[PDB]
Design an enzyme around this catalytic site. Structure first.
Site, PDB file in Angstrom:
ATOM      1  CB  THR A 117      29.795  41.142   6.888  1.00  0.00           C
ATOM      2  OG1 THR A 117      29.743  42.568   6.998  1.00  0.00           O
ATOM      3  CG2 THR A 117      30.428  40.590   8.144  1.00  0.00           C
ATOM      4  CB  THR A 118      30.691  44.582   2.688  1.00  0.00           C
ATOM      5  OG1 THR A 118      30.045  45.228   3.791  1.00  0.00           O
ATOM      6  CG2 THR A 118      30.188  45.217   1.415  1.00  0.00           C
ATOM      7  CG  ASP A 133      33.386  46.769  14.422  1.00  0.00           C
ATOM      8  OD1 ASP A 133      32.748  45.714  14.225  1.00  0.00           O
ATOM      9  OD2 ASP A 133      32.949  47.898  14.119  1.00  0.00           O
ATOM     10  CG  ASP A 154      27.989  46.060   7.723  1.00  0.00           C
ATOM     11  OD1 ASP A 154      29.207  45.836   7.573  1.00  0.00           O
ATOM     12  OD2 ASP A 154      27.199  45.236   8.228  1.00  0.00           O
TER      13      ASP A 154
END
Lengths: 508, 509, 59, 102
Positions: free
Chosen positions: A81-82, A382, A48
């Protein structure tokens, strides 16, 4: 001349990708764990790569925009976010071609800001509208993304718990973005993932009751922001003490004024009292608290200062600093306040509902020990974000890297049909789009160059009949085997990099 | 001490001032570039600016030609408002033109004497571009919305600019002949969005007083005062501080209850319905105020109280030096209106029709502070527009005009001095090259296109930089303020000659 | 003897965890699991040197 | 460096009055052994300065019970005072020693 800031730009363009190129390996659920060497020297197996950016980074202004880029993706979405890393380095490849061509960065900035507004328009047509007031439609939409992500081992039972949690704060069909500033995550040390649930109002930690009540019906939520003791320079009880009378005459008088302040609490009506830490003050007198708890008031103590500011805005217990702020609006009104000591190790106080603006929703995380508890924390949050990103953006888009290959196919076509000295910029903007699923189609294996040209074999004719499916590990339609995502996690990953790119174009 | 010779000083002045002029020409224009901020000390924190004034504050300037520019950058900042980044590039555009003259042989006193005459000649050409707009209420209304988009977009605010554009030009319209900053009360406040921002006709205090005190006051009498209750002010009524006794505490404990009772009698004999106090009001005089109908304000602003006596016609009590001779303010309506998340005090219908209060509503501290600094730079220029309701045609259109007029005078005069006037008229044309590079275009094309315009005298049209195409003037959005350029032309021609004066630089640090 | 020795690389560190993972559970096959994984490392590297995704071999 | 002894003197002055309390702490437990035997057999007074004032046995039990509690209140602050002054001075022994060297 801008020639000396010209060399600064290409150095900034080169340096921003070089940190971001390690995230190319870490891209996707089949992405690579990246073992971190610390500044003092230690190994840290990490995926991540937003967390990698927070953990280990170099001090470079283009690199310091990268940790800001993912942090905005953390707070707006928390997902993608990656992917928000990979889009920005892809755009910098488009920037190098046009600056070598001799195009002003002001031109390349405004062309990308137009194509950003233009790309999300065509991407919205790719998306399909789903419900936000149907609780069941939200359940199917969320868990398919949750099974698409890495953790689904605890997200199965914890998907509908999050669905019932957001459904209380879904009052309209518009269903705004979501405040996580009424969502409180509470750990219980024992218990089970099966026993994790949603307790309304707020859930408190350890109470401190000297003679106080345990279960009070129709409680009054109070706040204390005043000290009960003497000034302190070296000693809390500033005596030069060597004598019994001088310690008796001044310390009985310390009991005197804290007698009168305690009586003002119960007469105005209080049953639950919020006390912060005694390091957040100078001292708190427990004998007055014993007399307070003897006046039948349940009391918690030693809580954080900013955590009270979470509590004050969630359940409407507006800040009480003195005796004079004992009112009806500064004090919250719980229907039932009690502590649950059983059903798991530890003990946690339950403010079961309160007179609260909106709906104050709190989850109780349980588990065997802290590591098992920390598994559910990623599992709930999440699950909270995929609901949060879908109520922000009504429609749903099937995820899997295919809509980027869809959108780059249209944006090359429209930029030809539009016009432009900046038409190259949009056609280079669209060339940056299919880099990210190609770098995803390395992590799936199954050669990405052979992969990425055969998705817009299906995105040109059937508009999508094949996708990148990490379940299959390659060429399988994301509509055939359902791999979806919210619309926001694609758009927010897209728009923040474009805003980042137009900045560093204008940065000298 | 290090005695810098003139051959060294010209190299130092050229590396000193021009590199500063390189930075401010980047952060010019809304389409123009930006600058990363690198702190000159340790732990360099970064911001991205479109403002050159903040660059001088972050990055330290120790170039002696450029340290002159810091003084010039401060004057257009404070006294003028907008024109900070524009005056500093323009002096650098002059100093680049002096380089070839210094390269030939030429004395700087040639260069100074030419540019002095060329400045005054272009100043009359600047007066030739003076066009009135206060001849109509509508054209003066059209005048205010022109420049309001210019200053705010120049100082890093263009996203919610138009909500501030409608509100700011209304309060300046009530000034009516007199430019006022002590009538426009500037209030920043967290809460709401930037579409929740508000314009009050009159005066405002951010006081949440509720229903304990009167919040609805019709036909007000306003006492502007600083008289406390527990501070035991001047005009003593009882005991004073003393030593060398142990039984004198009883006269001190009793005298506090008489002074607070007497000041309630003092306030009521004014005849007011509103007692504005800078200090804290104790609970016992406060509950005596709300029952009779006297408004009680505690913890008032230190500058707001002084601006309150101006807008209402009242006067400060001068820390209870005036117990009754202090004059009273009077206004029409005092209403508590919840603007945003907060309860506000709105003094409406004050004695000054010029008096207004803009209410800034930012969602965070990052947007709220940058909005007011651009808005304060706008209202200083708009107050100067109240005195002179004139514009000049921006986008370098007036820059092309005055450079022609110097070129005509440089082609009638040219003895020794107007070799510099030839270098003068180029440096005026160097400024539209920047904006065409800010827009990111062929500066050599757009200038020579615009040079062809004002050659026969096409002055009513210059380059609309949003496409870089030639477009309308005399109001477009780009037609700028008369008051700005006459200050910018004044300072940039001034300090650049002063840089030419300092050749005998001596470093003793 | 890996418990006796000290690790040098994180590559050396991760495998001392692996043999001890075998050794806590059973005493047989404890030194054998070290040799097998290192054979995998030379086999997959040539393929990664050839053309192969690292993702594809470990599948 | 004067900052070394200053944090020690402010700590040691608090300890001396604290050690005064502990002999009082034991004798506060001694009198509770003696007040428990009295139920009306012998009444108690209170020795306070130059005046010896009448008490009752329930009045005596609360009186030494309070003074037992005031000692424990001054014990706990010193435990905060102990760890703070020993950690602040420990940071000072490294930095202020380098000031006298160079």
């Amino acid at each position: 001349d801008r020639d000396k800031p010209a060399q600064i730009r290409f150095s900034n363009i080169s340096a921003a990708k070089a940190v971001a190129d390690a995230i190319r390996t870490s891209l996707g659920p089949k992405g690579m764990d990246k073992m971190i060497q610390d500044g003092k020297g230690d190994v840290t197996i990490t995926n991540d790569g937003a967390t990698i950016l927070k953990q280990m980074q170099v001090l470079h202004p283009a690199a310091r925009m990268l940790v800001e880029l993912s942090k905005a993706q953390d707070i707006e979405a928390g997902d993608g976010t990656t992917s928000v890393v990979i889009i920005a380095g892809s755009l910098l490849d488009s920037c190098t071609k046009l600056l070598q061509k001799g195009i002003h960065p002001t031109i390349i900035s405004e062309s990308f800001q137009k194509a950003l507004e233009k790309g999300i328009e065509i991407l919205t047509d790719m998306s399909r509208p789903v419900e936000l007031s149907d609780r069941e439609t939200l359940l199917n939409s969320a868990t398919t993304s949750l099974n698409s992500k890495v953790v689904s081992q605890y997200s199965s039972l914890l998907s509908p718990m999050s669905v019932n949690a957001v459904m209380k704060v879904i009052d309209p069909a518009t269903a705004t973005s979501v405040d996580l500033r009424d969502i409180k995550i509470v750990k219980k040390l024992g218990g089970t993932i099966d026993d994790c649930e949603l307790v309304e109002g707020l859930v408190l930690t350890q109470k401190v009751s000297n003679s106080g009540i345990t279960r009070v019906e129709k409680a009054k939520i109070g706040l204390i922001q005043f000290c009960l003791s003497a000034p302190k320079t070296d000693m809390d009880n500033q005596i030069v003490v060597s004598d019994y009378a001088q310690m008796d005459r001044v310390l009985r008088e310390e009991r005197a004024y804290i007698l009168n302040l305690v009586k003002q609490i119960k007469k105005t009506g209080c049953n639950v009292l919020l006390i912060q830490k005694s390091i957040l003050r100078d001292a708190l007198s427990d004998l007055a608290l014993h007399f307070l708890n003897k006046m039948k008031i349940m009391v918690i103590k030693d809580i954080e200062r900013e955590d009270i500011e979470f509590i004050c805005k969630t359940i409407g217990t507006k800040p009480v600093a003195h005796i004079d702020q004992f009112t009806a609006d500064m004090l919250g009104s719980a229907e039932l306040a009690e502590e649950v000591n059983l059903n798991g190790s530890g003990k946690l106080l339950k403010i079961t509902g309160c007179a609260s603006p909106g709906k104050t929703v709190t989850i109780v995380v349980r588990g065997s020990n802290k590591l098992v508890i920390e598994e559910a924390e990623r599992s709930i949050h999440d699950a909270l974000c995929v609901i949060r990103c879908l109520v922000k953006k009504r429609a749903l888009i099937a995820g899997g890297g295919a809509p980027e290959i869809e959108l780059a196919l249209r944006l090359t076509e429209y930029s030809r049909t539009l016009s432009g000295m900046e038409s190259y910029c949009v056609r280079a903007f669209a060339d940056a789009m299919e880099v990210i699923p190609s770098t995803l189609a390395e992590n799936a294996g199954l050669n990405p160059i052979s992969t990425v040209t055969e998705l817009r074999n299906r995105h040109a004719q059937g508009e999508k009949t094949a996708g990148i499916n990490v379940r299959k590990g390659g060429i399988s339609n994301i509509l055939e085997e359902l791999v979806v995502q919210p619309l926001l996690v694609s758009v927010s990953a897209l728009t923040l990099a474009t805003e980042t790119v137009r900045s560093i174009l204008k940065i000298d | 001490a290090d005695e810098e010779r003139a051959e060294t000083a010209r190299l130092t002045s050229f590396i000193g001032a021009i590199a500063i002029g390189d930075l401010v020409k980047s952060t010019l224009g809304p389409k123009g570039m930006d600058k990363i901020l690198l702190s000159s000390g340790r732990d360099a924190s970064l911001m991205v600016t479109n403002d050159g004034a903040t660059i001088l504050k972050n990055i330290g300037v120790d170039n002696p030609a450029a340290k002159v520019l810091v003084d010039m950058s401060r004057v257009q900042d404070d006294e003028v408002g907008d024109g900070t980044t524009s005056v500093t590039v323009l002096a650098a555009e002059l100093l680049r033109e002096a380089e070839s003259l210094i390269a030939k042989k030429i004395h700087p006193q040639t260069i100074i004497a030419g540019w002095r005459e060329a400045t005054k000649a272009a100043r009359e050409a600047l007066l030739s571009s003076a066009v009135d707009h206060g001849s109509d209420e509508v054209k003066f209304r059209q005048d205010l919305m022109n420049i309001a988009g210019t200053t705010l977009s120049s100082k890093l605010l263009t996203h919610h600019k138009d909500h501030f554009t409608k509100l700011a030009v209304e309060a300046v319209l009530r000034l009516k002949g007199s430019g006022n900053l002590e009538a426009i009360h500037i209030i920043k406040k967290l809460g709401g969005s930037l579409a929740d921002s508000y314009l009050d006709e009159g005066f405002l205090l951010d006081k949440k007083i509720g229903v304990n005190q009167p919040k609805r006051i019709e036909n007000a009498k306003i006492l502007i005062a600083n008289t406390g209750m527990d501070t035991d002010k001047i005009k003593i009524f009882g005991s004073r501080v003393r030593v060398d006794s142990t039984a004198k505490v009883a006269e001190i404990e009793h005298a506090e209850k008489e002074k607070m009772k007497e000041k309630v009698e003092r306030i009521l004999k004014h005849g007011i319905n509103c007692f504005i106090n800078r200090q804290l009001i104790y609970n016992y005089p406060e509950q005596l105020f709300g029952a009779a109908g006297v408004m009680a304000i505690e913890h008032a602003d230190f500058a707001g109280v002084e601006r309150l006596a101006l807008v209402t016609g009242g006067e400060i009590a001068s820390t209870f030096d005036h117990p009754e001779l202090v004059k009273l303010g009077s206004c029409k309506l005092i209403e508590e209106v919840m603007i945003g998340e907060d309860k506000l005090i709105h003094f409406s219908g004050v004695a000054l029709g010029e008096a207004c209060t803009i209410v800034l509503r930012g969602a965070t501290q990052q947007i709220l502070d940058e909005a007011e600094r651009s808005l304060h730079d706008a209202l200083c220029v708009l107050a100067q527009t109240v005195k002179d309701s004139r514009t000049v045609y921006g986008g370098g259109c007036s820059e092309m005009l005055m450079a022609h007029a110097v070129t005509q005078l440089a082609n009638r005069t040219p003895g020794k001095e107007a070799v510099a006037m030839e270098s003068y008229a180029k440096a005026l044309r160097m400024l539209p090259t920047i904006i065409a590079d800010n827009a990111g275009y062929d500066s050599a094309d757009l200038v020579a296109q615009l040079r062809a315009a004002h050659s026969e005298g096409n002055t009513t049209a210059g380059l609309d930089m949003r496409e870089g195409t030639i477009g309308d003037m005399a109001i477009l959005g780009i037609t700028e303020s008369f008051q700005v350029k006459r200050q910018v032309l004044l300072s940039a021609a001034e300090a650049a000659e002063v840089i030419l004066r300092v050749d005998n630089i001596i470093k003793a640090a | 003897i890996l418990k006796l020795l000290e690790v040098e690389h994180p590559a050396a560190k991760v495998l001392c965890e692996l043999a001890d993972l075998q050794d806590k559970e059973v005493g047989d096959g404890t030194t054998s699991v070290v040799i097998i994984a290192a054979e995998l490392l030379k086999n997959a590297d040539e393929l990664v040197k050839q053309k192969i995704h690292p993702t594809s071999v470990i599948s | 460096v004067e900052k070394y002894q200053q944090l020690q003197k402010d700590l040691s002055k608090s300890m001396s009055g604290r050690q005064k309390l502990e002999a009082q702490l034991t004798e506060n437990n001694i009198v509770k052994e003696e007040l428990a035997l009295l139920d009306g057999s012998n009444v108690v007074f209170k020795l306070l300065g130059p005046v010896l004032v009448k008490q009752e046995l329930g009045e005596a039990r609360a009186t030494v019970g309070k003074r037992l509690d005031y000692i424990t209140a001054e014990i706990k602050r010193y435990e905060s005072q102990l760890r703070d002054l020993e950690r602040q001075s420990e940071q000072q022994r490294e930095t202020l020693a380098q000031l006298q060297q160079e």
